[PDB]
Design a protein around this ligand. Sequence first.
Ligand code: BCL
Ligand code: BCL
Ligand code: BCL
Ligand SMILES: CC[C@H]1c2cc3[nH]c4c(c3C)C(=O)[C@H](C(=O)OC)c4c3nc(cc4[nH]c(cc(n2)[C@@H]1C)c(C(C)=O)c4C)[C@@H](C)[C@@H]3CCC(=O)OC/C=C(\C)CCC[C@H](C)CCC[C@H](C)CCCC(C)C
Ligand SMILES: CC[C@H]1c2cc3[nH]c4c(c3C)C(=O)[C@H](C(=O)OC)c4c3nc(cc4[nH]c(cc(n2)[C@@H]1C)c(C(C)=O)c4C)[C@@H](C)[C@@H]3CCC(=O)OC/C=C(\C)CCC[C@H](C)CCC[C@H](C)CCCC(C)C
Ligand SMILES: CC[C@H]1c2cc3[nH]c4c(c3C)C(=O)[C@H](C(=O)OC)c4c3nc(cc4[nH]c(cc(n2)[C@@H]1C)c(C(C)=O)c4C)[C@@H](C)[C@@H]3CCC(=O)OC/C=C(\C)CCC[C@H](C)CCC[C@H](C)CCCC(C)C
Ligand SMILES: COC1=C(OC)C(=O)C(C/C=C(\C)CC/C=C(\C)CC/C=C(\C)CC/C=C(\C)CC/C=C(\C)CC/C=C(\C)CC/C=C(/C)CC/C=C(\C)CC/C=C(\C)CCC=C(C)C)=C(C)C1=O
Ligand code: HEM
Ligand SMILES: COC(C)(C)C(=O)C/C=C(\C)CC/C=C(\C)CC/C=C(\C)CCCC/C(C)=C\CCC(C)CC/C=C(\C)CCC=C(C)C
Ligand SMILES: [Fe+3]
Lengths: 102, 76, 102, 51, 51, 255, 182, 325
Amino acid sequence: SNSLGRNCVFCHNSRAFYDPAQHTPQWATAMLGISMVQELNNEWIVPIGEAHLPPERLGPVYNDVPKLACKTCHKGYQQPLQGLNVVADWPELATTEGPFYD
Amino acid sequence: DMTCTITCWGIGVLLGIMTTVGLMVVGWSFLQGAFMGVLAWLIVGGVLAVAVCGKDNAEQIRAEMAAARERVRGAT
Amino acid sequence: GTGMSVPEFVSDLDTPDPTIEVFLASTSDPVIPEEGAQTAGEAYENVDPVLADLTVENYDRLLAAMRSWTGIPDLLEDPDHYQSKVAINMIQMNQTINEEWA
Amino acid sequence: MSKFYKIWLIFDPRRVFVAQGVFLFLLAAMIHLVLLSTEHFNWFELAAANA
Amino acid sequence: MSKFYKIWLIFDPRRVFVAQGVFLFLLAAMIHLVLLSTEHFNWFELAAANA
Amino acid sequence: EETFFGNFDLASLSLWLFYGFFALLIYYLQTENMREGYPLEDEDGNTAANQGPFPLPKEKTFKLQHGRGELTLPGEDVQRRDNLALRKTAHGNGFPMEPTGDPMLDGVGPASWSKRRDVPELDAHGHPKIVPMSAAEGFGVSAGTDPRGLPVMAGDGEIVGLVSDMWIDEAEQLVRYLELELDPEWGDGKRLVQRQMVRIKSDRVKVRSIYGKHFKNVPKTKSPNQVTLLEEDKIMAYYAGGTLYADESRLEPQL
Amino acid sequence: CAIGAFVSWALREVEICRKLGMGYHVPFAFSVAIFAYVTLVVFRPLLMGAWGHGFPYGIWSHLDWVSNTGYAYLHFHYNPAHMLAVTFFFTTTLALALHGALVLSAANPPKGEEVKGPDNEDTFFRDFIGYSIGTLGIHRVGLLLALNAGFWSAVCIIISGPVWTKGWPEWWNWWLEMPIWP
Amino acid sequence: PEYQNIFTQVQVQGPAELGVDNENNLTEERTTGTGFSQLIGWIGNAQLGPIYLGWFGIISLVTGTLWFNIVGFNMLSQVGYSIPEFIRQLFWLALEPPSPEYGLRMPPLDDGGWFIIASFFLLVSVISWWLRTYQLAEMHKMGKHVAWAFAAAIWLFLVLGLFRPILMGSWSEAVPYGIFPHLDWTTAFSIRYGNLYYNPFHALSIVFLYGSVLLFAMHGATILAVTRFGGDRELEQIYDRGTASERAGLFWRWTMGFNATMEGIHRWAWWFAVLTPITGGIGILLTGTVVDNWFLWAVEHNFAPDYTQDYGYEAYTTYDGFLGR
Ligand code: BCL
Ligand code: BCL
Ligand code: BCL
Ligand SMILES: CC[C@H]1c2cc3[nH]c4c(c3C)C(=O)[C@H](C(=O)OC)c4c3nc(cc4[nH]c(cc(n2)[C@@H]1C)c(C(C)=O)c4C)[C@@H](C)[C@@H]3CCC(=O)OC/C=C(\C)CCC[C@H](C)CCC[C@H](C)CCCC(C)C
Ligand SMILES: CC[C@H]1c2cc3[nH]c4c(c3C)C(=O)[C@H](C(=O)OC)c4c3nc(cc4[nH]c(cc(n2)[C@@H]1C)c(C(C)=O)c4C)[C@@H](C)[C@@H]3CCC(=O)OC/C=C(\C)CCC[C@H](C)CCC[C@H](C)CCCC(C)C
Ligand SMILES: CC[C@H]1c2cc3[nH]c4c(c3C)C(=O)[C@H](C(=O)OC)c4c3nc(cc4[nH]c(cc(n2)[C@@H]1C)c(C(C)=O)c4C)[C@@H](C)[C@@H]3CCC(=O)OC/C=C(\C)CCC[C@H](C)CCC[C@H](C)CCCC(C)C
Ligand SMILES: COC1=C(OC)C(=O)C(C/C=C(\C)CC/C=C(\C)CC/C=C(\C)CC/C=C(\C)CC/C=C(\C)CC/C=C(\C)CC/C=C(/C)CC/C=C(\C)CC/C=C(\C)CCC=C(C)C)=C(C)C1=O
Ligand code: HEM
Ligand SMILES: COC(C)(C)C(=O)C/C=C(\C)CC/C=C(\C)CC/C=C(\C)CCCC/C(C)=C\CCC(C)CC/C=C(\C)CCC=C(C)C
Ligand SMILES: [Fe+3]
């Protein structure tokens, strides 16, 4: 809630926190975001930094590597940059294959 | 002599407000200044009410009243 | 009647994200590839992810976008520096995010 | 300044003594703590730094 | 300085003694705890680090 | 966990048991509160045909202190008034009553009093509970404004006399009554005022309930050193009756 | 209709008090409950800008509204006025229990024993806890406690929507970030 | 306006009252020494003390002090013995119950031993106080209504701390000793087992709490209204009925069609207050042991409301429309 700037009744009905028939469509987006965050942390962000980052960027205890979460992108807003289209001008960062300028 | 006590309480409230505004001036926030202002109210108001209003009016009654307790003590 | 709502101050709804205007001042339109355009691999010595791009595309993505969005003024100049190796992986991570997590 | 002794003809010595005893200790404690809240005058940390 | 014995003619020694004892014990406990709160003078941890 | 039948489980059994217990408790509580004022009567003083769905409770006995006997309830009404100067304004039930003479002097309406015992209330030692301040040893004013010596102003702005004494409650250290010495113009003797109906100021004491002319007819105490329950009731209610009967405008609609 | 009925009930109580020649404390006490209800259904929706912020008229559907409104601020237990109101409620219940028990025990001694008086109750509570409030101060205390509970409930509900917007736990950052702390 | 009898106009002070006595010799254990407070004399009595010092009281005081000191020193040690940090985080610290993995066995000192020791001390202290309140009433020749009303709350105390953890077979089901942690426990307990609103006994306890608060407001207002007729001396009114009781009864009879007596209203008050912790403990004891989801229980028992409209903000407005773009 503090990451999106919303509250519990956003995505939930508090009289039944478990019932799938009393959720909103944003619940599914959050459920997808959980898996996306897990994959990003366990596949890309952590394997790198463990081999290149200097010691000065490792945290107070455990000497970890910095990780990302919801607020790394949302930063206290419902949508990052309040829904700005940041990919229409950069086809090179949209597809792993050859860029499609069509 | 409840009027003097109420006057002391009002002085404490005014001092708390003044200290709160001064704390805004220094660079604190509203609640941070308000807490210290309330502290000042209660402490200074209580101290003034106990001390200043504890000087009940008397010119020669006080001395004999003080002297009377100097006689009860010393033989008890 | 269920009490399901999200309150917000009117004076806070009118204040946009203070970083939206920064992005719009550091973006540019793409350049449509021509017939037989010279790629960035035939003009410098670079990494394979960024080797098939054109010269103008490499220009307006390398300096105009990446060296300002991350505030590293000399990104991707010395190939042995750790920041370049991190950025090369971050490009692919961004591509995967945009493709496989639509 | 030779007639300062008349203050004991007005103020109760016991109440004034109690008030002064509280106030002096309170002021000393606050002064010591204020000296402890800085970096240049913190002997506890200075001993560890010089060890 | 030679007439300091007159203080007992003003204050009852019972309350003074009780207050002195309580104040001394509380101050000693506070000072020992403050010494415990640091790293340089924490004698238990120093003994643990020397074994 | 399982069910006995259908959806019935331990929680339902507990709920139904609580329902039964609550019904019985409500019956007991309502029946316990019918020890005064029953059986009901009509407006002619006869027993009414309807008495309600709750029957009368059984008897209980109170053993009183200082050898004053015993009290058994429910029973006969010993505080009943004998001859009331009242008149019916209708032939049936449900309509008000009309005073026959002077309501303040006849003790009807908001000036009504109950026929209590004609003996003073006693403390733990067996002494009268309320005593004048001139006979209580070691009592003195510790806070507030001392009302003794101040003039008394009535409800219409008339000064009737000075406050001469206070009657205090020794057991609870509380002031109960203020004694008043009347000017010869406004009457003779002394009268008592309950502390709950006065407003002490720095220079005067004001009684807004009654006017100046109503001060000579305040009931007097038989003894100068004590007061009984019956006298307190009559004095206290006389003072309460003035909120309605001291003027014609206090009785008519305010609008 | 409900607002009209409540006001008429209060004024009828006023008329009965005037006829019986007693004080007007009961209508004044009822006015606080009327104030709390009006704050719930009138003042807060008026400040928030819609009549849809009032609770529904259902036996079991007016609790879902309470739940959803409480969870709209993340943790409603961290509201200080809610703390004050809950404390007042608990204190009022305890005081009522003690007063009833003391009066009943004084009026109902063991079988074969005489009844008691105010002196006995005063001794009991001074022996019990070291202080007695008296037969007159207890009623003042109870009335004040109930009125304070109602008033602080109204304040707690009215500050939640139009004055504070974020979560309630975050409100304590003024204490957690005071300059005096090292 | 008329005097409202909320603050006393003038105070009087006399010799201090030491208390009544009988052949039980209550004087031998009472202290000597009293004080007077003029600030409190504006509302109630001014005399302070004396107090009765038995053995139950001393035992309870010492053992409760031990519990307090244990909790406080554990909280202090958890922060590094830093007094400024102890003051800063006072409302956030606690003494946590043991871990779920230890069942009903005795856990280590790091994971719940001190919690068990402090809980044992607190139990002993509470039982000692109850025994003292019974003994005092037994020696003054009075009824034991105070002891029963305390036992009413001790029942809920024990259910929340002792009986339910044993029934559930774990010491981890107790409540932590902290200001904010205990509220967190309340909310987490409500969420974990469905919705506590749909527990009927929680509703009954809420009903009785509301009724008790309403009843004290009504009774205080009524007694202050008829105080001009000596209405605060309730016992003498019970023994010898006066006009104050008649007027107080007639007010409520004309208002709502039925009334009470001077002695019967206190029975109403006693029961409404006592019935709250009893129903609360009965409702709490059934959670988890019998019912694991209260919303599903309500649905199966057909008193859960149904809604027709849709969910989501996009069914009512637009994101751009909300921002005003
Ligand atoms: C997720 C839920 C949140 C929460 C969310 C809220 C919200 C939201 C509210 C409070 C409110 C309250 N909370 Mg909280 N609260 C929570 C849990 C708790 C807990 C606890 C966990 O122990 C406690 C003790 C309380 C207690 C309280 C009280 C302080 C307060 C209740 C108002 C009141 O009594 O006004 C009593 C006043 C009235 C409204 C009475 C009105 C009576 C009228 C005038 C007369 C009725 C006439 C009738 C129709 C006659 C017909 C009958 C005839 C005989 C036929 N909360 C949790 C943490 N709380 C409420 C509040 O403060 O409201 C102002 C509120 O709305
Ligand atoms: C690393 C060691 C810690 C320390 C650890 C402790 C511990 C632990 C304790 C104290 C205690 C005391 N310490 Mg030391 N103490 C330290 C250094 C100092 C210094 C200093 C400026 O250097 C002073 C003035 C003090 C002050 C004091 C006294 C207030 C007190 C014992 C005497 C007393 O109660 O009678 C006060 C004085 C008199 C009335 C006597 C009159 C004249 C006498 C001869 C003065 C000597 C007192 C003092 C101990 C001498 C230190 C002088 C040097 C500057 C060190 N300490 C350092 C910082 N100290 C003990 C105590 O009782 O605390 C409550 C105690 O338990
Ligand atoms: C998110 C929160 C959940 C919720 C979770 C709970 C839980 C969990 C519980 C309560 C409980 C209660 N709830 Mg609920 N409750 C909610 C919402 C509400 C709302 C509302 C929204 O308005 C209300 C009105 C209430 C109010 C209530 C009370 C009716 C009831 C407390 C019983 C009692 O007597 O407590 C008074 C407290 C006591 C009597 C405790 C015992 C006291 C003992 C005797 C203390 C001994 C003294 C001590 C050791 C010494 C101290 C030191 C001294 C200074 C010397 N709930 C929501 C839905 N509710 C309790 C209950 O019974 O529910 C069934 C309970 O456990
Ligand atoms: C702090 C103040 C406390 C208090 C005080 C209080 N209440 C009072 C009084 C006092 C001093 C009275 O003198 C008066 C009385 O006569 O009591 C016997 C009363 C009273 N308070 C009552 C109840 C009550 N008090 C409550 C609360 C409180 N009472 C507070 C805790 C509560 C709750 C929810 O806690 C309730 C339910 C009434 C029984 C009674 C007077 C109500 C009355 O009869 O009003 C006249 C109206 C009708 C006869 C019916 C009107 C019907 C409506 C027109 C339609 C329905 C509208 C309503 C919004 C529906 C709600 C449905 C719900 C399921 C949501
Ligand atoms: C909510 C009820 C709880 C409670 C309440 C309570 N106890 C009280 C009081 C109250 C309201 C007092 O007023 C009275 C007291 O003296 O308070 C300062 C007291 C008291 N209960 C005490 C103890 C006590 N009560 C206990 C029980 C409880 N205290 C209940 C659980 C316990 C427990 C739980 O074990 C203990 C240990 C004593 C400290 C004290 C009994 C008074 C006595 O024996 O002598 C006091 C008299 C004097 C010698 C002088 C007055 C004391 C002043 C502090 C000094 C001078 C002040 C001046 C005279 C006026 C005071 C100003 C006011 C603002 C107080
Ligand atoms: C009918 C149910 C209601 C109820 C009733 C009730 N409570 C009761 C009683 C009754 C009938 C008592 O007879 C008993 C009592 O003594 O009342 C005065 C009590 C009591 N209910 C209490 C608390 C309480 N009641 C609560 C609620 C309720 N109790 C219900 C609403 C609640 C809550 C959560 O709502 C609490 C917190 C206590 C005040 C008291 C029980 C006293 C007790 O058990 O003491 C044991 C002793 C100790 C733990 C030692 C403590 C040592 C301290 C560290 C210092 C000494 C005490 C000191 C006075 C405090 C600090 C003073 C400072 C100046 C230093
Ligand atoms: C020490 O001191 C004290 C006392 O004393 C000794 C006391 O006692 C009390 C009181 C305390 C108690 C009794 C304890 C119990 C109390 C409670 C548990 C509190 C909770 C109470 C309730 C739940 C019950 C309250 C009930 C109410 C409010 C409803 C009752 C009201 C009505 C039925 C309607 C009111 C009637 C009116 C307005 C008059 C009719 C109107 C007219 C215009 C008349 C014209 C004629 C007609 C319309 C046709 C005929 C009308 C009829 C028959 C009316 C019925 C109509 C119906 C439709 C049914 C206290 C506090 C006290 O401290
Ligand atoms: C657990 C993880 C996350 C949660 C709970 C979350 C929450 C949400 C929700 C609910 C929405 C839809 C909002 C709406 O419908 O208005 C959303 C969309 C979005 N989120 Fe997040 N998010 C998470 C993490 C992230 C991260 C880490 C990224 C990017 C890498 C991200 C970027 C976005 C974007 C770009 C949108 C806008 C989609 C659109 O509506 O067009 N989110 N998020
Ligand atoms: C160190 O500094 C000093 C000296 C100043 C101090 O001492 C400081 C002290 C503090 C700052 C202390 C602060 C204390 C708190 C904030 C305490 C808070 C306490 C609670 C909220 C306690 C709640 C307790 C209980 C609850 C909610 C319910 C039920 C409990 C019980 C029934 C407990 C009884 C336990 C039993 C029966 C189990 C015993 C186990 C056996 C095996 C017999
Ligand atoms: Fe009462």
